[PDB]
Design a protein around this ligand. Structure first.
Ligand SMILES: CC(=O)N[C@H]1[C@H](O[C@H]2C[C@@H](C(=O)NCCS(=O)(=O)O)[NH2+][C@@H]2CO)O[C@H](CO)[C@@H](OS(=O)(=O)O)[C@@H]1O
Ligand SMILES: CC(=O)N[C@@H]1[C@@H](O)[C@H](O[C@@H]2O[C@H](CO)[C@@H](O)[C@H](O)[C@H]2NC(C)=O)[C@@H](CO)O[C@@H]1O
Ligand SMILES: [Ca+2]
Length: 312
């Protein structure tokens, strides 16, 4: 009947003689009441995926922006985005009212992330997270905390840690939430009492809550294209310049910037030259989801492209 197996102190699998795995097991038992033998049986089935390690290590004008953009903004994609928007219009409108994050932004996020649920990932979250926690020193602490949180999520939401699949970094569902993002920002938007990242309605409200929690200002502008070139200045979402500095560099806003006294300098490689943008606070917020200028511009433009296609 009851099999404590106090003596089975040694697990097999790819993490058997791994000190990190043992320390992690100790932590989970001590800190959360996890049973060592149960956890060992789980981690013994965990796999050390070398590809997850090679991929994390791997992370002019030649048209760079255009190549990234065509991966997400195509007729097929925009069309699929319209379908997703109409199918979940109530959930999107309700997220707009509760969090102040517009439907196009959520449609854009979920679009760039999983093509509205068509590409959720094929890697078991446990394998990816265990690999990065135990065989990847550089970000071993971050990922260990992700693994720690994933295992508590499996317990709380009554999931099997081995059945859940996602990205090579362990991101999950429609919005590709990392375990800690789930813990801090996910919400039961569907109202069934359970926070499921694979439920389109939950992902929608969770993406909006994540945005609001990261500073999204309702009604404010994301980015404003500029007339002109400013080759002297450095660029990226991390940069910061006053409007006065940008004007003196040869730029003018195609749209009124209002009370915005500062902006970042975004530069997109459009093949024939460079396209300059005034990055406003809301664009910085989009990058809090995924630290990339290209990622955020794709999310924004796809959302806008889908928004237009609905009107037509
Ligand atoms: C919504 C969400 O959970 N965003 C998190 C993001 O996930 C990214 C990770 C990425 C991912 O899974 N990348 C793997 C690469 S591949 O596509 O499988 O090849 N997708 C997710 C959503 O955009 O990773 C960064 C950095 O870890 C996190 O920032 S941090 O807290 O400061 O660390 C951020 O919170
Ligand atoms: C080569 C290519 O075009 N790949 C696409 C992937 O980039 C997409 O994967 C998703 O990309 C975002 C942005 O980096 C990640 O944050 C997210 O985790 C990732 N999703 C998954 C499940 O791994 C994919 C979905 O749009 O579509 C292409 O395969
Ligand atoms: Ca739910």
């Amino acid at each position: 009947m009851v099999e404590p197996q106090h003596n089975v102190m040694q697990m097999g699998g790819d993490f058997a003689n791994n000190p990190n795995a043992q320390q992690f097991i100790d932590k989970m038992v001590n800190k959360h009441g996890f049973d060592r033998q149960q956890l060992q049986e789980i981690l013994s089935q965990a796999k050390r995926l070398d590809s997850v390690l090679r991929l994390m290590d791997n992370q002019g004008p030649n048209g760079a922006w255009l190549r990234y953009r065509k991966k997400f903004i195509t007729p097929d994609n925009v069309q699929n985005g319209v379908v997703f928007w109409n199918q979940y219009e109530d959930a999107l409108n309700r997220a707009w009212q509760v969090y102040g994050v517009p439907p196009e932004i959520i449609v854009g996020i979920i679009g760039v992330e999983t093509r509205w649920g068509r590409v959720m990932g094929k890697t078991r979250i446990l394998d990816a997270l265990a690999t990065l926690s135990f065989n990847y020193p550089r970000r071993a602490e971050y990922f260990s905390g992700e693994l720690e949180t994933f295992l508590l999520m499996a317990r709380d939401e009554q999931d099997d840690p081995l059945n859940l699949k996602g990205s090579f970094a362990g991101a999950m569902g429609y919005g590709q939430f990392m375990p800690s993002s789930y813990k801090q920002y996910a919400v039961d938007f569907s109202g069934d009492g359970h926070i499921n990242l694979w439920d389109p309605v939950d992902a929608i409200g969770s993406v909006a809550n994540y945005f609001k929690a990261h500073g999204w200002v309702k009604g404010d502008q994301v980015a404003v294209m500029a007339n002109g070139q400013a080759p002297g200045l450095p660029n990226g979402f991390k940069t910061k310049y006053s409007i006065s500095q940008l004007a003196a560099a040869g730029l003018t806003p195609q749209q009124p910037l209002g009370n915005h006294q500062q902006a970042s300098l975004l530069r997109l490689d459009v093949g024939t030259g460079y396209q300059y943008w005034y990055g406003l606070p809301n664009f910085y917020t989009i990058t809090r989801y995924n630290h990339s200028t290209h990622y955020a511009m794709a999310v924004w433009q796809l959302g806008q492209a889908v928004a237009l296609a609905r009107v037509q």
